[PDB]
Design a protein around this ligand. Structure first.
Ligand SMILES: [Mg+2]
Ligand SMILES: [Zn+2]
Ligand SMILES: [Zn+2]
Ligand SMILES: [Zn+2]
Lengths: 66, 49, 49, 113, 263, 49, 45, 61
RNA sequence: UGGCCGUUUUCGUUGU
């Protein structure tokens, strides 16, 4: 849905880094690189930012009842 | 015997915590032209059972 | 119910009389029964659900 | 729906004293300690040192069930010393070791940066 | 007797070398500082109103994980023990967020930075949310679209990582010893030989490999622990270490007081 | 008058989220209550690879 | 005394259980009640 | 007893400052149900905060 | 002022 706050396994806060990851991906850097420049070495964190799916944009694409 | 041990903190970090929605149903019912059933807060004196 | 009291216990199907026994009570938290891992065979049971 | 209070893993009820001692009458100079609100974090540390002492014959503990926050420690010092004194001696020893480690780390961090 | 040798220091990550202490002690220190470091985090989320696509519980949870600067939490009493009726500013730090989006186009992105401290037992440096930098927007709490408003009245308290994983100041503790397995406490699986399969640890150069003719030492013990700490930022790694040591100390002191008082 | 309530299932808890109130095909009141809650994994769940 | 909200035009109003169930402003036939006023709590856990 | 079915908080105890509802008021030990958890806890009458016309009123309402 | 009442029958899907 949304990038989580704390990595489930370790606890290294990651959510704040999601936007930067998207940004780095924009200019075509390979994913491993981007994960590097964020300083994510333990793959217990690499798994998330590599394989999280953003849905909240999809859920907002519907006009709210307000 | 195919049972698992879960990192308590991993649960507390939002692991496999999911949502559960239940929808209830009801409607006003008609016994005839002049007999219907109305949603309302029933007082104990006016109603029974 | 208090600890150490006697109560029956069972599984379905109850093929052979080693599928019913009388155990003793121990009060605990959480909402599951728990068995010593040895007694699974007489109940022919496993914790896969 | 029947889970224990997560604040109860460390908080103590009033009627139960933090620690409870039980002499072990089946052998000489042996005691059994009934702890409260403790686990490996304290037990392992106490046991390591109390084993390192010279005048301790037998020392051990066990965590009854991880669903309960208390453990039991077996201690049996030689006739030379009563167990209580040996335990408090080990307590002081770790206290001072930790103090020394803290002081050294403080100085090291000061110099490092 | 205990020694210390920091290898690389920083605000968050500490990569040191601890030697000449019982392995029991190093492990118990790791455990206690992972579990028994009092801190501050969001406790009671009171939602005045919400219009987002995220369940109220979902936000209350997301707030539960937000790291709070707790550099002075040691001064804050336990809300369980504080004598005040309801909460007080000496046992509770109040934070409130009220963000909104307007306009029919675009999407707002409420971040942690938008959080605000309303009160707190000042000037104790507690309550402030943590940030890597000043311009670093930080943690993403939600996204808002046209007419969607979010309002909340948070609360924090002093709890411990035992009672929940939000009170954990430690993120990931490395830990090891005997990088060449001198003490042999591990037996190495292999298909041909142990050495040509298993790659070497990063502390490989820090202790000399055993000599081929070297024979076992049955009195050998673990002596040098290399434990690399890290933190979320809610507390400085040095503060983490000192506070863990202090907590363990006072705990043993309590135990000794109980022992002496019992008689 | 007699009670014709629709009590919540006694084995459930949560917060009422979204009440709907419209007419049925036949023009009587016709309600829907979507109660919600979140399920924390605990002892006795099920999981699978 | 019992507010509402439309599902098509999202404009608020009320009714006294006698008006037909329709949106006053756009006439839509799907409505929802609005949040209560008592205070809502979460332990964030 | 006119002191039932009212919003109530806890001023002292392990749940200091939690909104709760009085579900059962047999006597001298009020059974109050909270919101944050899915459970109901007994609690003495003097360890609670009762909503009143203005502000939060202790057990004198 | 105690005392105190919530369908059946089908079919389905699943579970061990
Ligand atoms: Mg099976
Ligand atoms: Zn991680
Ligand atoms: Zn206070
Ligand atoms: Zn409308």
């Amino acid at each position: 849905m949304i990038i989580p706050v704390r990595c489930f396994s370790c606890g290294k806060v990651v959510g704040d880094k999601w936007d930067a990851y998207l940004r780095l991906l924009e200019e075509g850097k390979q994913e491993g690189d981007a994960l590097d420049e964020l300083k994510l070495k333990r793959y217990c964190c690499r798994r998330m930012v590599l394989t999280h799916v953003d849905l909240i944009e999809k859920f907002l694409r519907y006009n709210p009842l307000e | 015997e195919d049972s698992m041990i879960m990192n308590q903190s991993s649960i507390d970090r939002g692991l496999f915590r999911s949502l559960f929605f239940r929808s209830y149903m009801d409607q006003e019912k008609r016994f005839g032209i002049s007999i219907v059933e109305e949603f309302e807060k029933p007082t104990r004196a006016t109603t029974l059972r | 119910l208090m600890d150490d009291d006697p109560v029956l216990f069972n599984r379905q199907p109850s093929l052979h009389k080693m599928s019913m026994m009388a155990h003793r009570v121990k009060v605990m938290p959480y909402s599951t029964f728990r068995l010593n891992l040895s007694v699974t065979s007489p109940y022919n049971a496993d914790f896969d659900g | 729906m029947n889970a224990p209070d997560r604040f109860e893993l460390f908080i103590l009820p009033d009627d139960v004293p933090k620690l409870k001692i039980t002499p072990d009458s089946r052998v000489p100079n042996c005691i059994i300690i009934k702890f409260e609100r403790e686990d490996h974090t304290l037990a392992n540390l106490l046991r390591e040192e109390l084993a390192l002492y010279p005048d301790v014959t037998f020392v051990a503990y066990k965590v009854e069930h991880p669903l309960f926050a208390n453990f039991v420690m077996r201690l049996q010092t030689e006739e030379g010393t009563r167990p209580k004194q040996a335990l408090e001696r080990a307590c002081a020893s770790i206290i001072n070791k930790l103090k020394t480690l803290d002081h050294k780390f403080n100085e090291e961090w000061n110099i490092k940066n | 007797e205990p020694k210390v040798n920091i290898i690389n220091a920083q605000d968050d990550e500490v990569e040191l070398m601890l030697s000449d202490v019982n392995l029991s002690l190093a492990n118990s220190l790791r455990r206690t500082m992972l579990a028994e470091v009092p801190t501050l985090a969001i406790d009671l989320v009171e939602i005045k109103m919400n219009t987002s696509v995220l369940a109220d519980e979902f936000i209350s949870h997301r707030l539960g994980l937000i790291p709070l600067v707790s550099e002075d939490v040691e001064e804050m009493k336990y809300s369980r023990d504080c004598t005040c009726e309801d909460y007080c500013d000496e046992c509770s730090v109040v934070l409130e967020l009220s963000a909104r989006h307007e306009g029919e186009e675009g999407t707002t992105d409420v971040y942690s930075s938008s959080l605000i401290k309303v009160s707190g037992p000042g000037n104790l440096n507690v309550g402030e949310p943590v940030r890597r930098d000043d311009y670093d927007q930080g943690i993403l709490l939600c996204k808002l679209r046209n007419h969607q408003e979010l309002n909340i009245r948070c609360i924090a308290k002093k709890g411990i990582a035992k009672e929940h994983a939000k009170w954990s100041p430690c993120s990931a503790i490395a830990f090891e010893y005997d990088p060449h397995n001198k003490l042999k406490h591990t037996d190495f699986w292999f298909e041909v030989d142990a050495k040509k399969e298993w790659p070497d640890s990063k502390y490989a150069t820090w202790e000399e490999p055993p000599k081929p003719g070297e024979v076992f030492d049955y009195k050998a013990k673990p002596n040098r622990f290399y434990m690399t700490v890290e933190t979320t930022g809610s507390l400085k790694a040095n503060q983490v270490f000192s506070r863990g040591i202090k907590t363990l100390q006072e705990k043993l002191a309590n135990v000794l007081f109980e022992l002496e008082n019992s008689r | 008058k007699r009670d014709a309530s629709t009590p919540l299932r006694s084995t459930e808890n949560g917060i009422v989220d979204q009440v709907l109130l419209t007419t049925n095909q036949e023009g009587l009141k016709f309600v829907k209550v979507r109660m919600r809650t979140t399920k924390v994994p605990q002892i006795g769940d099920k999981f699978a690879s | 005394g019992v507010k509402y909200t439309c599902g098509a035009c999202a404009h608020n109003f009320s009714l006294n259980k006698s008006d037909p169930v329709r949106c006053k402003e756009c006439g839509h036939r799907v409505i929802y009640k609005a949040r209560t006023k008592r205070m809502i709590q979460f332990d964030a856990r | 007893d006119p002191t039932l079915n009212k919003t109530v908080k806890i001023r002292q105890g392990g749940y200091k400052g939690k909104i709760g509802i009085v579900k059962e008021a047999n006597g001298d030990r009020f059974r109050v149900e909270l919101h944050n958890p899915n459970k109901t806890i007994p609690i003495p009458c003097s360890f609670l905060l009762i909503e009143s016309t203005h502000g939060w009123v202790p057990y004198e309402d």
